[PDB]
Amino acid sequence: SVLTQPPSASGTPGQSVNISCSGSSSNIGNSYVYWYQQLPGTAPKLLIYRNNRRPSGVPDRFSGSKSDTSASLAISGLRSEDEADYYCATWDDSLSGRLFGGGTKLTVLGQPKAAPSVTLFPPSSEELQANKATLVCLISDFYPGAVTVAWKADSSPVKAGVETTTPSKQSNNKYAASSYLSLTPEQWKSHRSYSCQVTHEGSTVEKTVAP
Amino acid sequence: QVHLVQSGSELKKPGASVKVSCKASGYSFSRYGIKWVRQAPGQGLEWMGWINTRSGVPAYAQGFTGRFVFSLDTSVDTAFLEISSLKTEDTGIYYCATRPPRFYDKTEYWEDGFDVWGRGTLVTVSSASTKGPSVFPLAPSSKSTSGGTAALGCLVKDYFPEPVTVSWNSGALTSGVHTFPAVLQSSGLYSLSSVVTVPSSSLGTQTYICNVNHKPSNTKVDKRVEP
Ligand code: NA
Ligand code: NA
Ligand code: NA
Ligand code: NA
């Protein structure tokens, strides 16, 4: 069970932004939603509790909502000081525990949105001879600076053996990141294909390689 | 007002243990349960479980088995997280916080003290052993690049510590080179890739060589990257 949040939400100063949090009947369906604000390098802070209530010191610019098995955080009057990662969380009856979403970076646009270019390299024959296999997914040219990378084997999700960087800018003033999937040569050979899927704002880009 | 004071940073070898403290400061310790939450560097929050500060009984998330133990010492208003047999993949910041119970409805009692976080404790697990890289060619592919060009590269795998430098054709080739920030893997080793976009027509007659230098291990590798 996961609570699915977009990697990135963005606007210009003063705009409203609406950050989604998608669950199921056995988490958001059944339980109260909380939102946290985490500024980079700092502890998460409670923003919203019980779906739509604000603790003291939280301005009513921040609003929460819950509908069936999804929830949302709206931020009006967007300003720089809002820039942070935002997490939703609920009790998940299936995990018997509290579950956090993946988090959404909020960016006040300093330039127009730019969609990611994705380059996916298969393992080299040399590496396979060394009894290892690394798929290399290079993601470039995006803004704002946050993505979600998902890997698939024969188009089912693979979570094991994944290492993904944060975004950093290249000289073109757009963000890039890299993600690496580690396999055995036996895994690589035995599947029809592996995929790197990158989600960014309105874009999903999926590149697939085969042995 | 809740304040939670957490013990400082820890630098640990694989197989060692660590005991992180989370001390309540300026409120009554048994008022609220304490939740533990991990965050690997640059990544999301992971709920580890929580401990009941009245009864003492811990409850663990499914991810977190024998090696992770929550405990209390109510003589000094402190919750602990104890990790044994530390792995490099344990590296991250470990937060404690107060937590709310599950509620039936919104008519139930609420205080803001229900959800207040400590600053977190960074636990770094690393051998800090010097490891040279393995370098592999990333053969040219035209899929992702402009008309009449192809991307090719080198994968520089499993080294420690930073840094690695990469040049192409001994510095003669600089245009369109991108050497990506390294990833710090769950293994505790680094990898990175360097990619360059070149003319497709050149492929059958221009040699491309990445020059990888890992000073810390005194390793130099030059890899020819062929179609
Ligand atoms: Na990173
Ligand atoms: Na005790
Ligand atoms: Na909790
Ligand atoms: Na609840």
Edge-first strand listing for the sheet containing B33-39:
B10-12, B121-125, B92-99, B33-39, B45-51, B58-60
Task: State how far the Cα of A62 lies from the Cα of B84, in Å rounded to an integer.
Answer: 41
A contacts of B99 (beta carbons < 8 Å): 98
A contacts of B141 (beta carbons < 8 Å): 119, 121
CA A176 vs. chain centroid, Å, equals 15
Place of tokens 């976009």: B197
Q: Is the distance from CB of B214 to CB of B159 less than 8 angstroms?
A: yes
Helices of type H across chain B: none
Q: Is the distance from CB of B206 to CB of B120 less than 8 angstroms?
A: no
Query: Please, what is the Cα angle at A195 between A190 and A196, to 5 degrees?
Result: 140
Facing residue for A43 by CB, picked from B95, B157, B181: B95
**Measured between CA atoms, how close is A127 to chain B, in angstroms?**
7
Q: Is the distance from CB of B152 to CB of B178 less than 8 angstroms?
A: no
Place of tokens 């895994």: A187
Q: At B22, list the tokens.
A: 């989370």
Helices and strands (DSSP H and E) totals, chain B = 0, 18
Superfamily (CATH) of domain B128-227: Immunoglobulins (2.60.40.10)
Facing residue for B183 by CB, picked from A97, A121, A180: A180
Check CB contact of A74 with chain B, cutoff 8 Å. no
- Stretch (H or E) spanning A126: helix A125-129
B contacts of A170 (beta carbons < 8 Å): 178
Give just the sign of the alpha carbon dihedral A49, A55, A57, A60: positive
Neighbours of B185 (CB within 10 A): 20
Q: Between chains, do B117 and A43 touch, taking CB under 8 Å as contact?
A: yes
Which chain A residue shows the shortest CA-CA distance from B46? A100
Cα B75 to ligand 2 centroid, rounded to whole Å = 6
Q: At B183, list the tokens.
A: 């990833």
Facing residue for A138 by CB, picked from B42, B47, B195: B195
* Spatial CA neighbour of B226 closest among B174, B152, B170, B176: B152
Q: Which site among B3, B32, B43, B45 would you substitute to test the A interface, given the most A Cβ atoms closer than 10 Å to its Cβ? A: B45
Q: At B117, list the tokens.
A: 């976080």
Three-class SS state of B215: helix
Q: At A155, list the tokens.
A: 């188009």
* Spatial CA neighbour of B173 closest among B204, B194, B191: B194
- What Å distances lie between residue B62 and A114, B59, B81, B115, CA to CA? 38, 10, 16, 22
* Spatial CA neighbour of B39 closest among A152, A40, A82, A186: A40
Instruction: Tell me where in chain B the CATH 2.60.40.10 domain(s) lie.
Output: 128-227
What 8-state DSSP symbol labels residue A186?
H
Q: Name the experiment that determined this structure.
A: X-ray
Instruction: Report the DSSP pairing between strands B121-125 and B10-12.
Output: parallel
Going from the N-terminus, what domains does chain A have, and what CATH number goes with each? 1-110 (2.60.40.10), 111-211 (2.60.40.10)
Q: Is the distance from CB of B132 to CB of B162 less than 8 angstroms?
A: no
Neighbours of B19 (CB within 10 A): 13
Task: State how far the Cα of B157 lies from the Cα of B165, in Å rounded to an integer.
Answer: 13
Task: State how far the Cα of A75 lies from the Cα of A89, in Å rounded to an integer.
Answer: 17
